């Protein structure tokens, strides 16, 4: 409607969260459970919709552009660590496309 961060929480995040392919990005990549010793060495700034959701609820972000940066970090993190063509990458790509659709309808 008017405030940007409100939009990001109530519209953008809700849409991405409901999506079929959301579940692997709803919490930090648990690198112990998954047997990934190198993840937290390669990915300097980890990110998930879980953490973004927390930050929107907890008046953490200075402004919408900081939150959008985190969404991009989540996607690019996935594309850095994983081989192009992997299942997880196609899922990230699907969410990214939808993310960018919803970001165009953003108030100002
Ligand atoms: C989405 C998905 C499908 C699948 F069939 C198998 C896995 C591991 C998978 O990814 C995850 C499943 C669960 C979780 C939880 C919820 C436990 O955190 C995370 C992932 C997962 C999420 N993200 C964002 C990743 O980038 C990633 C990478 C891996 C991964 C696990 N093992 C590998 C891998 C390592 C070396 C060689 C080949 C694959 N990659 O798993 C995930």
Curated annotation (Swiss-Prot):
Tissue-wise expression: Ubiquitously expressed.
Effect of residue 87 to G: Found in a patient with a neurodevelopmental syndrome; uncertain significance
Localization (cell): Nucleus; Chromosome
Post-translational modifications reported in the UniProt record: Phosphorylation by CK2 disrupt the intramolecular binding between the bromo domain 2 and the NPS region and promotes binding between the NPS and the BID regions, leading to activate the protein and promote binding to acetylated histones. In absence of phosphorylation, BRD4 does not localize to p53/TP53 target gene promoters, phosphorylation promoting recruitment to p53/TP53 target promoters.
Record-annotated site: Acetylated histone binding: 82
Glycyl lysine isopeptide (Lys-Gly) (interchain with G-Cter in SUMO2) cross-link, renumbered residues: 41
Highest taxon of the lineage: Eukaryota
Bromo domain ranges (all copies): 1-106
Main function: Chromatin reader protein that recognizes and binds acetylated histones and plays a key role in transmission of epigenetic memory across cell divisions and transcription regulation. Remains associated with acetylated chromatin throughout the entire cell cycle and provides epigenetic memory for postmitotic G1 gene transcription by preserving acetylated chromatin status and maintaining high-order chromatin structure. During interphase, plays a key role in regulating the transcription of signal-inducible genes by associating with the P-TEFb complex and recruiting it to promoters.
Disease per record: Cornelia de Lange syndrome 6: A form of Cornelia de Lange syndrome, a clinically heterogeneous developmental disorder associated with malformations affecting multiple systems. It is characterized by facial dysmorphisms, abnormal hands and feet, growth delay, cognitive retardation, hirsutism, gastroesophageal dysfunction and cardiac, ophthalmologic and genitourinary anomalies. CDLS6 inheritance is autosomal dominant. A chromosomal aberration involving BRD4 is found in a rare, aggressive, and lethal carcinoma arising in midline organs of young people. Translocation t(15;19)(q14;p13) with NUTM1 which produces a BRD4-NUTM1 fusion protein.
Assembly information from the UniProt record: Interacts with p53/TP53; the interaction is direct. Interacts (via CTD region) with CDK9 and CCNT1, acting as an associated component of P-TEFb complex. Interacts with RELA (when acetylated at 'Lys-310'). Interacts (via NET domain) with NSD3, CHD4, BICRA and ATAD5. The interaction with BICRA bridges BRD4 to the GBAF complex. Interacts (via NET domain) with JMJD6 (via JmjC and N-terminal domains); the interaction is stronger in presence of ssRNA and recruits JMJD6 on distal enhancers. Interacts with NSD3. Interacts with NIPBL. (Microbial infection) Interacts with bovine papillomavirus type 1 regulatory protein E2. This interactions may serve for the tethering of viral genomes to host mitotic chromosomes allowing successful partitioning of the viral genome during cell division.
Misc: JQ1, a thieno-triazolo-1,4-diazepine derivative, and I-BET, a benzodiazepine derivative, have been tested on tumors with success. Treatment with GSK1210151A (I-BET151, a I-BET derivative) has strong effets on mixed lineage leukemia and promotes myeloid differentiation and leukemia stem-cell depletion.
Family per record: Belongs to the BET family.
Swiss-Prot/TrEMBL domain comment: The NET domain mediates interaction with a number of chromatin proteins involved in transcription regulation (NSD3, JMJD6, CHD4, GLTSCR1 and ATAD5). The C-terminal (CTD) region mediates interaction and recruitment of CDK9 and CCNT1 subunits of the P-TEFb complex. It is also required for maintenance of higher-order chromatin structure.
Protein name: Bromodomain-containing protein 4
Name of the gene this protein is made from: BRD4
Included range, full protein: 59 to 166 of 1362
């Amino acid at each position: 409607q008017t405030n940007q961060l409100q939009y990001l929480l109530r519209v953008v995040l809700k849409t991405l969260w409901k999506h079929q392919f959301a579940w692997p990005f709803q919490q930090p990549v648990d690198a112990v459970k998954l047997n990934l010793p190198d993840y937290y060495k390669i990915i300097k700034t980890p990110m998930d919709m879980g953490t973004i959701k927390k930050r929107l609820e907890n008046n953490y972000y200075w402004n919408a552009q900081e939150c959008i940066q985190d969404f991009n970090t989540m996607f690019t993190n996935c594309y850095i660590y994983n081989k192009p063509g992997d299942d997880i990458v196609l899922m990230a790509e699907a969410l990214e496309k939808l993310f960018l659709q919803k970001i165009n309808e953003l108030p100002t």
